[PDB]
Amino acid sequence: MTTLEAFAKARSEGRAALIPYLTAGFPSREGFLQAVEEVLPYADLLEIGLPYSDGPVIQRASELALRKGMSVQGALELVREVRALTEKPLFLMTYLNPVLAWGPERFFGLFKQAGATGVILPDLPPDEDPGLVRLAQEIGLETVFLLAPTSTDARIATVVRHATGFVYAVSVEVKDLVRRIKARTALPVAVGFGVSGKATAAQAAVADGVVVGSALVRALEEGRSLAPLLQEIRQGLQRLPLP
């Protein structure tokens, strides 16, 4: 199930893909693995975050995961164990600092080896280091880059020529942003707008995919079942002159 196939399946079913995002090792290593099991039935693709020292909800999750010993090596084994559970696309979200510490070629090589389909690099404007981007892609990883509501048409054009797998629009109104990105690329467009239930999901349903991250941190923090929450979101992702 390639990334493209995952998005296509959701579209053929008349819904935006649901992309759970879980921070590796949060609330604990075992807690993370159990969360993975609970969200898989709702996942078209899965995002796994690599905890890093430097919104507040995700920062909280990364903080605790780190306090409990999560590391790059710990995340690599977790990616392997998640890959053993599913054939679905798995994307590792990581800031650049840890990648530079391990060495890009080694870092990307290890995660590709571990079973990752690609990486999401939030703090790397692809146009600023195409060499690094090509390195990850040559290794076999899809590379997702970010766009924000402030992105000009030129910056959308610039980012979509480096992104593979999908492009991610984050608002740390959805229809307008999705329209402007889709006008410049056929790549699937995923959005992150703090979706937490049916109503908010319905507003984001226009996107090819919707990431659910902060809402899961809260559910995990409060010790609540994840299925009810994801079910409400799934139901909202199902699709129905101005001056």
Side-chain angles (χ1 to χ4, degrees):
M1 183 66 89
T2 65
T3 298
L4 186 61
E5 289 171 349
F7 279 105
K9 188 175 184 297
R11 175 155 298 272
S12 72
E13 292 173 358
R15 64 195 178 76
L18 196 161
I19 306 170
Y21 165 29
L22 294 171
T23 293
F26 175 87
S28 64
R29 188 175 190 289
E30 61 180 60
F32 165 82
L33 288 173
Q34 189 62 38
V36 168
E37 176 180 300
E38 289 184 61
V39 310
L40 275 174
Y42 287 90
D44 288 292
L45 299 87
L46 181 64
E47 177 181 355
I48 298 176
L50 175 61
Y52 172 58
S53 63
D54 283 62
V57 182
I58 302 297
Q59 290 182 284
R60 202 156 61 230
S62 173
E63 183 68 297
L64 183 56
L66 287 171
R67 291 190 176 182
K68 291 187 175 177
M70 185 47 58
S71 64
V72 170
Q73 280 292 171
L76 282 165
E77 175 61 14
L78 283 178
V79 167
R80 302 200 185 88
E81 293 191 27
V82 174
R83 175 51 73 208
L85 298 173
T86 184
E87 299 176 60
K88 293 174 176 178
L90 301 180
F91 281 78
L92 180 84
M93 184 298 295
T94 184
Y95 287 88
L96 209 57
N97 190 274
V99 181
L100 308 182
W102 278 78
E105 190 183 306
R106 176 165 59 171
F107 184 97
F108 293 136
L110 288 173
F111 276 97
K112 174 63 179 177
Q113 255 184 22
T117 307
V119 291
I120 297 168
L121 302 170
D123 77 335
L124 173 63
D127 51 305
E128 290 179 19
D129 200 339
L132 189 164
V133 180
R134 294 195 297 278
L135 177 58
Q137 302 182 343
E138 274 185 343
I139 286 176
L141 294 166
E142 277 173 330
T143 55
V144 179
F145 298 105
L146 283 56
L147 283 169
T150 52
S151 299
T152 63
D153 299 321
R155 174 110 310 248
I156 292 175
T158 298
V159 173
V160 301
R161 87 177 32 130
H162 295 286
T164 58
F166 64 95
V167 189
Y168 189 34
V170 296
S171 172
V172 173
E173 290 297 302
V174 180
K175 174 179 182 180
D176 185 70
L177 180 54
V178 169
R179 172 184 62 67
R180 305 190 45 243
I181 297 173
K182 284 192 156 300
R184 309 185 164 51
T185 187
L187 279 171
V189 181
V191 302
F193 280 67
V195 171
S196 63
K198 189 188 301 186
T200 48
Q203 300 177 59
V206 57
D208 299 308
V210 174
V211 172
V212 180
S214 293
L216 286 176
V217 170
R218 293 196 297 291
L220 288 167
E221 276 181 343
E222 299 180 359
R224 303 182 191 295
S225 302
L226 306 185
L229 167 60
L230 293 179
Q231 181 58 38
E232 279 290 296
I233 290 178
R234 168 171 278 174
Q235 290 178 215
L237 297 178
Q238 190 66 47
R239 302 187 179 115
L240 299 176
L242 295 174

